[PDB]
C-alpha cells in the first residue's frame, strides 16, 4: 500500500566539500587564559569550588589555549603557544598539556599535515568549541604521557581527554582516527554535540548545535557520539569499532539527524546505536550494526517519526531492533540476521510500521512485540512517560529460520499482516 521511504542524499557530505565551510580570510587571536573566566567551560565543570581536580592535573590555577576573533589553525598554536603546553615532540606530532577552548567567535582547524594530536591525559586536556571547529585527514588520540600510548580504556571514572561543543556552535570532521576519549562524567562522553544546560540557554538564545562528522574512525571511546538537543547533525562512513558503552548515542531532544553508511561494531558494553528520550524525525539508513554487547540499534524514550532503513543489523548479543516506547517510527526493508535474541522486539509502542523487514536465524524470534509495566523501576516516569500497549502494521518481508519462531505479538491492541512471508 505504500511506496519506499524518501532518504536524504549523502553525494554532498564530503570531506571536500567539508573544507569549505569555514572563514579562513580572517586571523586570528590566541591566549592563555584561566578557565573560570570562561562560560564554555564553567558550564559543564560548575562553580569555583569544582576547579580542585584540574588544579591537580595542571599542578596550578587552571587555564587553557583560547581561540577567538578570527581564524587560527593547529600550526598557528604551536607557533604562538609555550612548549610546555603545546610541544611539537616529532614532525606532525603535537601534545597538548592544557585545554584547547574555541570561542564564539573562534574559528579552529586541524587540516593534514598534522600527523597526530595527542591530548595528555595526566594534565586534563581536552577541547570544548563554543564556534567554528573543522578537522580534516588527521588524528585527534587521547594520550596516556606516563603510558606514552593512547589512554585505553579501563574505569569509568578515570578522566580521559574528550571532544565537546556547545550551543551555537558548528563542527565538520572528516577523514579522521580518533581513540580512547570519553569517560563517565557529565559532557565528557568522547564526542559530544550539546545545547547548553537549560539555565544558560535561557540567557545566551544561541542555535541549536550542529555539523557532520564523516568517514572517520571512532575506537576505545566511551561513547563514539553523544548529542543532546541537536539539530541536523550529519553522521556518515564512519567506523565505531570497539567502544566501551555505546556506539553512536543521539540524545534527549535531537531532531533531524542523518545516520548513515557507518559501520558500528565490537560495542563493549551496550548498543551500537541508540536514539534516546525524544530524538524525533531522524534517519537511521544503510548502517552495519552488528556484535555489539547488547543490540544493534536502540529506539527509546518516546523517540518518534524517525526512519530506520536498509540497515545490515547482525550478530548482535541481544536484540537486532530493539523499540523501547517509542511509537510512530517506520522501519523499513532493513536485513536483521542473526543476533543471539530478537530480530526486532518492540515494547511498549504504538504504530509501528515495519514494511519489508527480513529477519532471519535470530536466537529468538524474528518479530517480538510486547508489553511491561514500567512502575517500580528505577525510570523517571515523570520525564519519560510510557503507555503500555502495543499495536503494528507488517507488510512484506520474510521471517525465517528464527530459534523460537517467526513471531511472536503478546496482548496487543492490534495487528496487521500483509504478505509476510514465512518459511
Not at 573566566?37 to 569544582?50: S, Y
Not at 574528550?162 to 551555537?168: A, R
Not at 540497515?311 to 531492533?321: L, S
Request: with cysteine; net charge neutral; proline share 4%.
Amino acid at each position: 500500500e505504500m511506496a519506499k521511504p524518501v532518504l536524504p542524499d549523502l553525494s554532498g557530505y564530503t570531506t571536500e566539500a567539508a573544507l569549505k565551510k569555514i572563514a579562513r580570510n580572517k586571523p586570528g587571536k590566541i591566549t592563555v587564559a584561566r578557565m573560570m573566566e570562561e562560560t564554555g567551560l564553567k558550564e559543564f565543570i560548575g562553580g569555583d569550588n569544582k576547579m580542585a581536580e584540574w588544579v591537580v592535573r595542571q599542578k596550578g590555577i587552571p587555564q587553557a589555549i583560547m581561540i577567538s576573533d578570527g581564524y587560527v589553525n593547529l600550526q598557528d598554536l604551536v607557533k604562538k603557544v609555550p612548549k610546555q603546553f603545546l610541544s611539537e615532540v616529532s614532525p606532525g606530532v603535537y601534545v597538548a598539556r592544557l585545554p584547547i577552548l574555541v570561542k564564539e567567535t573562534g574559528i579552529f582547524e586541524i587540516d593534514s599535515k598534522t600527523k597526530e594530536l595527542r591530548l595528555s591525559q595526566e594534565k586534563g586536556s581536552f577541547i570544548v568549541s563554543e564556534g567554528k571547529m573543522l578537522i580534516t585527514n588527521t588524528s585527534v588520540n587521547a594520550w596516556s604521557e606516563t603510558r606514552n600510548g593512547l589512554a585505553a580504556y579501563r574505569t569509568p571514572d578515570e578522566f580521559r581527554p574528550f571532544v565537546l561543543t556547545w550551543g551555537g556552535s558548528q563542527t565538520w570532521i572528516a577523514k579522521t582516527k580518533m581513540a580512547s576519549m570519553g569517560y563517565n562524567q557529565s559532557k565528557s562522553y568522547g564526542v559530544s554535540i550539546s545545547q547548553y544546560n537549560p539555565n544558560t540557554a535561557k540567557v545566551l538564545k544561541r542555535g541549536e548545535p550542529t555539523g557532520w562528522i564523516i568517514d572517520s574512525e571512532f575506537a576505545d571511546m566511551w561513547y563514539g557520539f553523544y548529542c543532546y538537543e541537536t539539530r541536523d547533525f550529519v553522521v556518515k562512513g564512519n567506523t565505531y569499532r570497539d567502544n566501551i558503552v555505546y556506539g553512536i548515542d543521539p540524545h534527549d531532544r535531537s531532531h533531524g539527524l542523518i545516520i548513515a553508511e557507518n559501520d558500528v561494531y565490537g560495542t563493549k558494553k551496550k548498543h551500537g546505536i541508540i536514539i534516546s528520550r525524544e530524538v524525533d524525525n531522524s534517519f537511521i539508513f544503510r548502517n552495519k550494526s552488528h556484535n555489539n554487547k547488547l543490540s544493534g540499534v536502540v529506539l527509546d524514550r518516546n523517540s518518534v517519526g524517525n526512519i530506520v532503513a536498509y540497515n545490515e543489523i547482525y550478530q548482535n548479543h541481544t536484540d537486532g531492533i530493539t523499540l523501547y516506547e517509542s511509537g510512530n517510527n517506520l522501519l523499513w526493508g532493513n536485513r536483521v540476521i542473526a543476533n543471539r535474541r530478537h530480530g526486532i522486539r518492540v515494547r511498549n509502542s504504538v504504530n509501528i510500521k515495519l514494511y519489508e523487514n527480513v529477519a532471519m536465524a535470530n536466537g529468538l524470534m524474528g518479530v517480538y512485540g510486547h508489553i511491561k509495566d514500567l512502575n517500580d523501576t528505577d525510570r523517571d516516569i515523570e520525564l519519560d512517560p510510557f503507555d503500555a500497549q502495543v499495536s503494528l502494521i507488517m507488510v512484506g518481508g520474510e521471517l525465517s529460520s528464527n530459534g523460537s519462531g517467526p513471531l511472536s505479538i503478546d496482548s496487543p491492541l492490534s495487528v496487521e499482516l500483509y504478505r509476510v512471508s514465512m518459511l
